[PDB]
From Swiss-Prot, chains A, B:
GO terms of molecular function: hormone receptor binding; long-chain fatty acid binding; long-chain fatty acid transmembrane transporter activity
Domain description: Forms a beta-barrel structure that accommodates the hydrophobic ligand in its interior.
Ranges annotated as spanning the membrane: none
Mutagenesis or variant effect for residue 66 to A: Abolishes export from nucleus
Coiled-coil annotated residue ranges, if any: none
Organism: Mus musculus (Mouse)
Listed name of the protein: Fatty acid-binding protein, adipocyte
Role: Lipid transport protein in adipocytes. Binds both long chain fatty acids and retinoic acid. Delivers long-chain fatty acids and retinoic acid to their cognate receptors in the nucleus.
Gene that this polypeptide is encoded by: Fabp4
Motif (Nuclear localization signal): 21-31
Amino acid sequence: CDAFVGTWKLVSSENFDDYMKEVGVGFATRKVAGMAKPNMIISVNGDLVTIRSESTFKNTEISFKLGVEFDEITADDRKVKSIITLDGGALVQVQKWDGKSTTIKRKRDGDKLVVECVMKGVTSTRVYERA
Amino acid sequence: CDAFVGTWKLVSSENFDDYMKEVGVGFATRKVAGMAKPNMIISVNGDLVTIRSESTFKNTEISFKLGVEFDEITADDRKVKSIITLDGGALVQVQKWDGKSTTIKRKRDGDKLVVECVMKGVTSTRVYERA
Ligand SMILES: CCCCCCCCCCCCCCCCCC(=O)O
Ligand SMILES: CCCCCCCCCCCCCCCCCC(=O)O
């Protein structure tokens, strides 16, 4: 996933508050989240890929091997089981918790990194450019 | 309620999608609603006050006597019991349905009409100016 390595800064977001509503995130956290303009830092070391999101409010960090299910605690504090695979040049993440699931796809589009989040038919698109 | 009579056009809205989420309005109706820039027409005839909201998508109209509870079917199709009183120069509306309630206050502020909608601690403010 060499095309993903770097530091990325958020440029635009579409429907992210609707996505968070569908995921069940509360009002106060949804308002903090929409004020954040996180930076995403992706790095690879051997077999382990690390994705870090940094903001004034909350930093998150996950390190994983592609194809191996792992425990993740999301920024909104859900404890989920995640698995990320490399498919068609995109990182596809599925998170499962309480009988629910959501898909987060990170893909390159031109010189940008695009994050698509889908929860029960609601789709959010967030576009990042290199910092 | 002479200070309210006229045709008013929406100028700004704050937190209305969050208010609709709290009321339980579905995704598609919330998206149509946020695209509408309704005109509000208020008129008085004898004892009956009429408030009409017009948009490309949905027109609603309620006629009522201040202080008398009546049946209303909202734009998002809830069948509610409403009562509107005149208090401190503002029209205060309470809608009750399924053991829930929400308050909609319509008040004058300078040359504007302000609508405040409150559902369980989430507040939306919509400002109208004369058309
Ligand atoms: C006080 C906490 C402040 C930060 C809150 C962030 C809350 C985000 C809740 C929903 C997380 C959804 C999963 C991440 C979706 C992709 C986000 C991204 O990388 O742009
Ligand atoms: C297809 C329907 C298109 C129009 C949808 C409008 C849906 C609005 C749903 C919520 C109604 C809340 C009550 C009205 C709140 C005050 C609105 C206002 O006068 O600005």
